[PDB]
Amino acid sequence: LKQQKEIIEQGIDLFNKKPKRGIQYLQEQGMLGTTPEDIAQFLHQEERLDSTQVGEFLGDNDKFNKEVMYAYVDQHDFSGKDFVSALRMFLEGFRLPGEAQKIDRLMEKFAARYLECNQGQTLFASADTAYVLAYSIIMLTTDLHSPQVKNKMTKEQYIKMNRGINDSKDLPEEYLSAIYNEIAGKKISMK
Template identity: 55%
Template sequence: MVNGLLKTAQGAPPGTATTLLPPQEVTMKLEAMKSLVAILKSMGDWMNKQLHIPDPHSAKKPDAAENIPGPGSLPMANGNGDEAVEGLDSHSETSTEASDVSTIEQQRAYKLEFQEGISLFNRNPKKGIEFLINANKLGNSVEEIAAFLKNTSGLNKTLIGDYLGEREDFSLKVMHAYVECFDFQGLDFDEAIRVFLQGFRLPGEAQKIDRIMEKFAERYCKCNPKVFSSADTAYVLAYSVILLNTDAHGEE
């Protein structure tokens, strides 16, 4: 079906005799183009549901008026002004439909490359982030990377935790930016811990847990300055809660 629509949209090869009048041929091409656009849009919607990743900013749809040639650029056939207007309208609408097809293809390519970056992250977080930055799918600031880790579905939560717990300077800054994304104001301490840990799994290494929970305690005290006398007290309590929870699961 798609091949048939493509052939119709392209029109008959030069020199091939047809029984269609020129206005009829233009209409057939336009309708075929509309059908192809509808098919591509349906495929795009299906991919959105399958990939579960954020859409890029859609390119602005060109104004139909911009595609209409200026006065004198398109001669009138047989001196008939009505035919010239019809030709202009058909040309404008066809150009707009072609632009829609191009936009959908660009969005599809964006989604596929973004998904490739997620798959790479789930094998090696640092390489996945580097790939997305080099492909211009992700900014290189710690705030943008932190937002990516917090908001992107499909990322392995265990690997997110491992990355956040790294002691390298850049990863440490990303972890700090990640924690700063949370607003714990008004939350009980145990509820804040639960909300915080929904997006990733704590790594198994004690030093990584220590770094993450120390920053969590600092952030909680900043949001709720009257709950604890110091961030150190909150940190000790948070770390104890994690250890007790780990022991409980270990006994099970």
């Protein structure tokens, strides 16, 4: 159709079939800019973009996708010295892709952005500490809250995931138990 209102909704529909097709259509139509920050903002603002497609797009290895993903994470504010809440805010927006390589890029950038927003912060010696913790949380919430895993990961098990070879860049066990309790009682969701 003709009205820009309709064009945006058509782009959104097209994105839901194939993200890059939706983006290009909107760019052709003069409805969307061409920088990573333009696309990232679009991704943040349009709640009707399909959750799974946003995850696959943000996690994709192509150069342009990664730049969009960086800008997308940079438009979050992760202040407050509250790691899990930060991660929950991040993962409210879309559905994590399945491919481990994708989760890995997403978790690495999440961790870098978290520390950048918490510079006086104390627990995490390096981005790697944060990245490993974040990844362990994804694994924990998948293990605890997927009925296909019948032997659930235990608190002792979880703590092991977060050791070696850093061994001082390593997190207190009391902190890992508290996170375990938090994730066991309240799954990571989009809702």
